[PDB]
Design a protein around this nucleic acid. Structure first.
Lengths: 51, 772, 696, 158, 50
RNA sequence: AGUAGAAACAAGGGCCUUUU
């Protein structure tokens, strides 16, 4: 999964995390749109399921 | 500082003497190395006994004195002796210290801010540790093991290099002031150096240790060991804890270190380019060399040139061999006959002629060697040791583990020795069409029979029948092989021996410089063939990732994106030295003359015509803003310039700059059409293709005077020009001269003018004008 | 590497390499000159630079890489076409915009000598350019274009750096025109000798060289000389089955007595509980002294056997006094001086101060070395061997480290087996002797290092732990410090390895001695001690040691390694043949023959036979000498012949009698050799009932 | 590179007493600590330090005429007390891209009575509930926040 | 210790790339490929140390 | 005395060369 928010050790225990470069955020500016670059994180986790 | 003044005073005092003066005046600086040996020479036979006797004393070690005073280290805490003012005979500036003194420092003593740099210094061993931690062990079992001996690598290493390519790297990262002239390996691998430099900079460290560790980080430890199971460095590093002669600790270690993928990709690329060049008829050699030098590939983060990796690997494949031969790369004495592997142990011989009739009467020449010669052979999960004698397979022994592999190895061996009647009278099934010359290129009967076997299993059975069959005598029942490949039978083949236990692969630390023909068949100072293009798979389709086939024939893009890429290339080539180029103009702040360049004039037609003015305005704006101050990013001007050719206008810029082919670039963010990174500031990615930017000027991102070296060059020495440092070297004017110190005991004169030409072309073309 | 061509390929293009190679082959010159020529050639290439003339045609034409005849043909062709004068010598390149040849030169020396010689040879006929690897240029005309110069100097700089890195930047690889003949400076004396060391038929190195360079093979004379030498030799061949091995002939005389410094079976010890605070040797020796037993001793002036009893008695009294003074030190008196060999070092007499009258006064002949004398078979060795196999009422005699964690079955198996073996071995008697030797030697080495030139007092002690009963009764068994006797050193001024520092041994026993075995000791009747009361004896003797024996005895924990190796090997081999965990079964079931009794063979599981191998290794560590070395080195032949006999392999030999002689030569006054030799004889005898190749 | 060389380069023979602006973006500072700054810089009115591996602002000397600052792309956290004593006449501040968890770290900025605009983007504080309003209630003198005033009034260019 | 996150996906700390929906490519195999074409995923190159 | 071996030590230089 993708995220732009660094993790905390308690809530995120089953997750393995990385740092995958950067990305962009887009927001209004008057009558135009702009883009502000931010970092990017990658959340890795394993889990099971059933029918 | 004052220390510098003290060093000067010491130099003066030392020169006042006569002998010291004579030795520091005579000869070159290399003599230092020699002087380094005549001093401090003393060894011991059994350091163990000596160590015990020595440490038994009450002040057994030596240590610095001023470091202790500065460290406020006392001579007691609660009554235990820590050191005593005195002088060793050798150092004369050290004092005898106790073993208790070390403990004192660690427990309570001079604390330091941080020490995580260690993890980088010894990265190889922390990698060992991590690889170990990511293992899932399994049960333990007892049984006998077939451990074959062979030469392998035990240290997983990325970007394996040579020694000459390291002695330089250990300097530009640690000792840059004492650096020598820039070698090609540096100019090519800039980002790597920058990375290694970012970590060991502005740190308190012992540098000799770092250099030694770097040597280990770039050394694959090659050993001749017994081995069982798969062959991967990740295993060989801990083989001691996986199995022995009688026991095995099962464990899965497949998903780690991602090594062999790189090798198989390399070999696939080699096969591809070999086939491509084979498509030619008269210049496949130069075609292949061009395909080589016109290609690159990614390794982890960095982009490396193919021809550079090929000369570092040791994959003995019929593809890598050809390439390494074209580039004049020496290699080992290892053969290849189709998929199998071979190696000669002893014997000799010479070529000889013979003929065979294909159908009815159709004479076809086939050659075979003269005197007896031994050979080791290695097919999938199967080994063999055989002998050939005058067009016959004298004897052979096998130690494999499979029937199919055994039979295939035996058949390929029989072929390699031209043993049997088929080579005397070929079968009816084969014809002149299957003979040779798909499009003119002949084929020796050997590979003919090879493919004839690979076609049908019954051809293989008949070929085996060509070998004598007899009744399995008593006792030899175990050392016998049937037609199916059974360890025993009532009737078995002729002159065969079987056994459990592979054969020990031979070894030889030899190298040979071979060549090849216009038909892609290598020769080794004899009529013997080590490789060819018939011993590799026919063909297959693959989608290569993170590769750069910057060559027309080896390209799939259309004229539009190719035109864009070539326009960018041409626009970058103007990044050299000399007026009329962008660096001089930037220095002069002539942001206007850039708009009138010819390259932008050639890329302009590609611009969206209905909004070319608006984009032009924006581009010119950015340029002025970057140029007027001096805080610019070279990777944005080269991107936006093509739009400044037209006249500004009015309109709403909506964030993106479109070409005429519905492909855009954005000023500030990397996209598929134009990408780059601060890590590797010497590359530009357009449509996946990579472009190498010269190193003439250094903007905000670039680092440490390693980005100006492609703008300088050597010239006739001039004592009038000044002598300066490596940091003020940026404040010179294009076309000026300056004296400088290089490495050690060497001064030269440089000029900030480049020379893009190389010697390859000049040597290659000039040599072609002499064979006429 | 491995050839100059591969080297040149490092910084040059292989094309020019091949070119210069073919060239040197043409002129047949030394292949060390591949480099210079290639460099010149490459320069010529980069000098052309594919420049062009006003007519869109090439401006320069290479003439260097071509053959000599072809090059001269082209030279004359151009001199004729463009109407130029023919040059006497050959050139390297020719230009068209000026229509005059050009010659290129190169050198390393920063001087004009090369350019002066060239200008004298050619005057001003054509254009000459000589560059220097260190940035210099000498010419006879206007300079070249700016791109040829900036490009030519860079290449030369790189090449010079590489060469200097390879130590080849010398006249050898980069000579001038003249210094092209390198040769060993053959002097006069060396030649005078070479013509004198020649074999007999020749008398000058020239004849030998001419005979060897042209030597041809004549197989027939070779075979004839081979057969001739094969007839005047008559090499004997002896199949062992026909020519059997006699028994070994041991020497004859008195019996080999005890030699080990410390007593093992006859040793008596006083024990106490160990407190962690008091753990040094100088402290325990006092703790045991306070209770009064160590002081209760009081020998008498009448010894059962030995010599110099008065010295021993006075020394014991002085030891007690020093212990009472809390200072493990002794004064230098006549007694100690006699027992410590203090002043019995020879006195030197220079020859310059010598004369015939002096010699005749006191005979000063060459020392007559008195080699050791033979001995007989010892009958007390089996007793010690059988005593060192039983428990000792305690364990933990030999200190050992801890076991690390485990994560996989392998380490679990290893730890389990190691624990079993260690628990089995730590309870024996040989173990306490090993620990005793370890600790006593450590203390003695420390003392010899710290307090030389001073007579000290060191105890003979050890540390152990009482065995573990069931949870009933007092749990957590305690530790124990045991003391077997006292030791004393004498001025261990170990100036050099292999030296000797005399020591003395005062030990406690409750068993009377034997003249044959306890020959060197000097026993005294001390008194009585409890258990009830029993008499007491005091065995006393003298000996010495050195650095090496100390270091090795301290390192007496290798026997464990050897025994574990043997056992684990056997067990793993037996387990692999069946592909199943067969270790405990192999230790509890597999029987190992261990001796004879009543003329029959005896057997016990491996779990109990480990002790025999352990004692064997310990004795190898104790009685090690040159004699045992030679013996154990020469006995392997017999074992290999035995194995060949077991497998019906028709072994043979050339002269076994000489082997038996060599073996019996190194059997002298060393009990271990005699014991093992007698046991080997018994082995071959018992096997003769099942094998050949041995005589009775 | 290094803030020292960057500074010495920007100072093209100019005294550190007549400049009105300075920039040090895309540089490096050991231990994330300022290096080369002094009170000599008096007329300076603007500063820009971005992506220099900074972590704290304790070392910064006393600058009065400064009226705009930029510290984005760094990992500063905790030290906003130093800004009040050293630069009491500051009006524009930017911290987007730094490590900011709670509001207690922001409270000191109330003493900067000359403060007009603040820029917090990509920080954890923004991910709270009632953050713009609570901040405004904490720093009333402030008017602009991340480029938007109360009622989301886009601020002009300059 | 505190109870950690348990759900399979992320709710508040999530993030998503966007693109226009094509009714002719309204399937996972197609949407993923399209998202991949522009090369924003290939730029995702996580470093070794987490 | 003693060690060990097929010769060497049994101090040498001008005062120097203690914890399982």
């Amino acid at each position: 999964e993708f995220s732009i928010r660094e993790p905390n050790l308690e809530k995120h225990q089953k997750y393995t995390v990385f740092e995958a470069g950067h990305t962009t955020v887009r927001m209004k500016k008057g009558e135009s749109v702009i883009g502000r670059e931010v970092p990017l994180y990658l959340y890795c986790r394993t889990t099971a399921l059933s029918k | 500082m004052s220390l510098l003044l003290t060093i000067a005073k010491e130099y003066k005092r030392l020169c006042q003497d006569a002998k010291a003066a004579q030795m520091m005046t005579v000869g070159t600086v290399s003599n230092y190395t020699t002087f380094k040996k005549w001093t401090t020479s003393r060894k011991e036979k059994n350091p163990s006994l000596r160590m015990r006797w020595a440490m038994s004393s009450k002040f057994p070690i030596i240590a610095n004195k001023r470091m202790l005073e500065e460290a406020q280290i006392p001579k007691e805490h609660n009554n235990v002796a820590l050191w005593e003012d005195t002088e060793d005979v050798s150092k004369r500036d050290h004092v005898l210290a106790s073993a208790s003194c070390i403990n004192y420092w660690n427990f309570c003593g001079p604390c330091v801010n941080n020490s995580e740099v260690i993890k980088e210094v010894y990265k190889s061993r922390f990698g060992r540790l991590e690889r170990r931690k990511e293992i899932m062990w399994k049960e333990l079992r007892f049984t006998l093991v077939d451990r074959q001996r062979r030469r392998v690598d035990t240290q997983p290493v990325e970007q394996r290099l040579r020694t000459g390519e390291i002695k330089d790297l250990q300097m530009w990262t640690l000792f840059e002031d004492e650096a020598p002239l820039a070698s090609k390996f540096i100019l090519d691998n800039y980002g790597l150096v920058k990375e290694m430099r970012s970590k060991f900079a502005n740190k308190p460290l012992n540098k000799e240790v770092v250099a030694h560790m770097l040597e280990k980080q770039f050394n694959p430890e090659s050993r001749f060991l017994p081995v069982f199971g798969a062959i991967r460095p990740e295993r060989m590093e801990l083989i001691h804890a996986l199995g022995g002669e009688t026991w095995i600790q099962e464990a899965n270690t497949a998903g780690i270190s991602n090594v062999d993928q790189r090798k198989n990709d390399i070999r696939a690329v080699c096969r591809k380019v070999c086939l491509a060049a084979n498509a030619s008829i008269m210049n496949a050699k130069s075609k292949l060399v061009e395909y080589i030098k016109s290609t690159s590939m990614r390794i982890g983060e960095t982009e490396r040139k193919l021809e550079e990796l090929i000369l570092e690997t040791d994959d003995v494949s019929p593809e890598v061999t050809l390439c390494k031969s074209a580039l004049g790369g020496q290699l080992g004495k290892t053969l290849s006959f189709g998929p199998m592997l071979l190696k000669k142990i002893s014997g000799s011989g010479v070529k000889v002629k013979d003929t065979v009739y294909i159908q009815g009467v159709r004479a076809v020449q086939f050659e075979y060697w003269s005197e007896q010669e031994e050979f080791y052979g290695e097919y999938k999960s199967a080994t063999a040791l055989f002998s050939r004698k005058e067009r016959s397979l004298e004897w052979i022994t096998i130690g494999g583990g499979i029937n199919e592999d055994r039979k295939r190895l035996l058949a390929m061996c029989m072929i390699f020795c031209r043993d049997g009647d088929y080579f005397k009278d070929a079968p009816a099934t084969i014809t002149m069409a299957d003979l040779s010359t798909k499009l003119g290129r002949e084929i020796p009967y050997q590979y003919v029979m090879m493919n004839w076997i690979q076609k049908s299993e019954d051809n293989l059975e008949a070929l085996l029948y060509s070998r004598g069959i007899v009744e399995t005598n008593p006792g030899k029942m175990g050392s016998s092989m049937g037609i199916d490949g059974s360890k025993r039978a009532i009737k078995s083949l002729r002159a065969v021996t079987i056994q459990s236990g592979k054969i020990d692969m031979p070894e030889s630390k030899e190298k040979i410089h071979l060549e090849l023909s216009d038909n892609l068949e290598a020769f080794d100072s004899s009529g013997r063939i080590v490789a060819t293009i018939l011993d590799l798979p026919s063909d297959k389709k693959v989608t290569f990732q993170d590769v750069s086939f910057q060559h027309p024939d080896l390209a799939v893009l259309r004229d539009e994106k190719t035109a864009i890429t070539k326009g960018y290339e041409a626009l970058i080539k103007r990044l050299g030295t000399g007026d009329n180029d962008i660096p001089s103009l930037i220095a002069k702040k002539d942001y206007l003359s850039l708009y009138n360049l010819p390259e932008v004039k050639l890329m302009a037609p590609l611009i969206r015509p209905n909004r070319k003015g608006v984009y032009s305005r924006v581009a010119r704006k950015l340029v002025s803003t970057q140029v007027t101050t001096g805080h610019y990013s070279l990777h944005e001007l080269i991107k936006v310039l093509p739009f400044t050719y037209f006249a500004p206008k009015q309109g709403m810029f909506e964030g993106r700059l479109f070409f005429s082919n519905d492909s855009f670039v954005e000023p500030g963010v990397n996209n598929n059409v134009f990408s780059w990174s601060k890590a590797d500031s010497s590359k530009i990615y357009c449509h996946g293709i990579a472009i190498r930017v010269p190193l003439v000027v250094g903007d905000e991102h670039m680092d440490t005077s390693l980005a100006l070296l492609e703008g300088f060059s050597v010239c006739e020495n001039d004592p009038r020009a000044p002598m300066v440092t490596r940091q003020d070297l940026i404040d010179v004017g294009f076309g000026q001269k300056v004296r400088l110190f290089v490495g050690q005991g060497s001064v030269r004169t440089f000029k900030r003018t480049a020379s893009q030409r190389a010697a390859s072309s000049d040597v290659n073309k000039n040599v072609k004008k002499i064979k006429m | 590497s491995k050839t100059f061509a591969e080297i040149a390929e490092a910084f040059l293009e292989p094309e020019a390499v091949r070119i210069a190679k073919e060239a040197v082959e043409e002129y047949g010159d030394h292949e060390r000159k591949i480099i210079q020529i290639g460099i010149h050639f490459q320069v010529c290439c980069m000098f052309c630079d594919e420049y062009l003339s006003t007519n869109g045609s090439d401006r320069f034409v290479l003439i260097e890489g071509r053959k000599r005849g072809t090059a001269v043909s082209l030279q004359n062709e151009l001199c004729k076409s463009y109407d130029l004068e023919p040059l006497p010598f050959l050139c390297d390149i020719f230009d068209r915009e000026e229509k005059q040849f050009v010659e290129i030169g190169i050198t390393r020396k920063a001087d004009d000598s090369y350019f002066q010689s060239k200008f004298g040879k050619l005057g001003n006929s054509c254009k000459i350019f000589v560059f220097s690897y260190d940035g210099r240029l000498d010419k006879n005309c206007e300079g070249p274009m700016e791109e040829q110069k900036l490009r030519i100097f860079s290449f030369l700089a790189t090449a010079a750096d590489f060469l200097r890195k390879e130590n080849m930047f010398n006249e050898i690889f980069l000579p001038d025109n003249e210094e092209t003949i390198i040769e060993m400076k053959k002097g006069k004396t060396f030649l005078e000798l070479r013509d004198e060391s020649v074999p007999l038929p020749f008398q000058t190195y020239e004849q030998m060289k001419d005979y060897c360079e042209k030597f041809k093979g004549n197989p027939r004379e070779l075979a004839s000389k081979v057969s001739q030498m094969q007839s005047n030799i008559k090499l004997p061949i002896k199949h062992y089955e026909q020519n059997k091995f006699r028994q070994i002939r041991l020497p004859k005389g008195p019996m080999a007595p005890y030699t080990h410094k410390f007593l093992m079976e006859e040793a008596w010890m006083f024990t106490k509980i160990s407190d962690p605070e008091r753990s040094r040797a100088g402290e325990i020796l006092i703790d045991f002294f306070k209770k009064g037993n160590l002081s209760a001793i009081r020998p008498k002036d009448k010894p059962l056997q030995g010599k110099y009893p008065i010295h021993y008695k006075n020394l014991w009294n002085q030891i007690k006094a020093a212990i009472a003074d809390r200072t493990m030190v002794i004064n230098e008196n006549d007694h100690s001086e006699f027992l410590g060999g203090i002043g019995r070092a020879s006195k030197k007499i220079p020859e310059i101060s010598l004369t015939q009258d002096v010699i005749t006064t006191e005979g000063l002949k060459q020392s007559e070395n008195k080699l050791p004398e033979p001995r007989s078979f010892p009958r007390w060795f089996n007793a010690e061997w059988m005593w060192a196999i039983k428990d000792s009422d305690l364990t933990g005699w030999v200190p050992m480290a801890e076991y690390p964690p485990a994560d996989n079955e392998l380490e679990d198996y290893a730890e389990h087996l190691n624990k079993t073996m260690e628990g089995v071995l730590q309870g024996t008697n040989c173990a306490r002797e090993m620990g005793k030797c370890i600790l006593t030697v450590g203390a003695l080495m420390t003392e010899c290092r710290l307090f030389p030139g001073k007579i000290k007092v060191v105890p003979i002690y050890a540390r152990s732990k009482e065995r573990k009963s069931m949870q009933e009764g007092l749990p957590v068994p305690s530790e124990m410090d045991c003391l077997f006797g006292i030791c004393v050193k004498s001025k261990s001024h170990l100036n050099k390895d292999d030296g000797m520092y005399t020591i003395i041994t005062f030990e406690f026993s409750i068993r009377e001695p034997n003249l044959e075995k306890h020959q060197k000791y000097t026993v005294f009747e001390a008194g009585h001690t409890t258990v009830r009361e029993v008499p007491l004896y005091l065995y006393c003797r003298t000996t010495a040691l050195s650095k090496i024996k100390n270091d090795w005895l301290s390192k007496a924990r290798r026997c464990f390694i050897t025994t574990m190796d043997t056992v684990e090997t056997i067990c793993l081999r037996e387990s692999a043949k069946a592909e199943e965990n067969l270790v405990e079964k192999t230790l509890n079931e597999k029987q190992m023959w261990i001796g004879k009794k009543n003329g029959e063979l005896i057997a016990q599981p491996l779990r109990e036979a480990l002790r025999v191998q352990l004692v064997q290794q310990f004795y190898f560590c104790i009685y090690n000498d040159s004699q045992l070395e030679g013996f154990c080195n020469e006995q392997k032949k017999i074992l290999m012949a035995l194995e060949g006999d077991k497998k019906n392999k028709s072994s043979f030999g050339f002269n076994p009698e000489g082997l038996l002689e060599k073996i019996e030569e190194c059997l002298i006054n060393n009990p271990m050799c005699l014991f093992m030799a007698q046991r080997l004889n018994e082995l071959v005898i018992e096997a003769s009932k099942r094998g050949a190749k041995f005589f009775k | 590179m290094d803030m020292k060389k960057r500074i010495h380069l920007e100072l093209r023979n100019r005294t550190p007493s007549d400049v009105k602006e300075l920039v040090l973006d895309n540089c490096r500072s050991y231990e994330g600590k300022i290096e080369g700054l002094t009170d000599e810089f008096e007329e300076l009115e603007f500063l820009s330090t971005i992506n220099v591996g900074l972590a704290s602002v304790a070392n910064l000397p006393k600058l009065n005429k400064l009226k705009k600052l930029e510290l984005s792309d760094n990992r500063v956290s905790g030290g906003l007390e130093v800004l009040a004593e050293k630069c009491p006449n500051l009006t524009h501040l930017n911290l987007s891209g730094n490590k900011i968890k709670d509001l207690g770290t922001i409270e000191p900025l109330k003493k900067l009575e000359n403060l007009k605009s603040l820029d917090l983007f990509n920080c954890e504080v923004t991910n709270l509930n009632d953050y713009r309003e609570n901040v405004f209630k904490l720093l009333p003198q402030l008017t602009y926040l991340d480029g938007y005033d109360r009622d989301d009034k886009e601020a002009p260019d300059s």
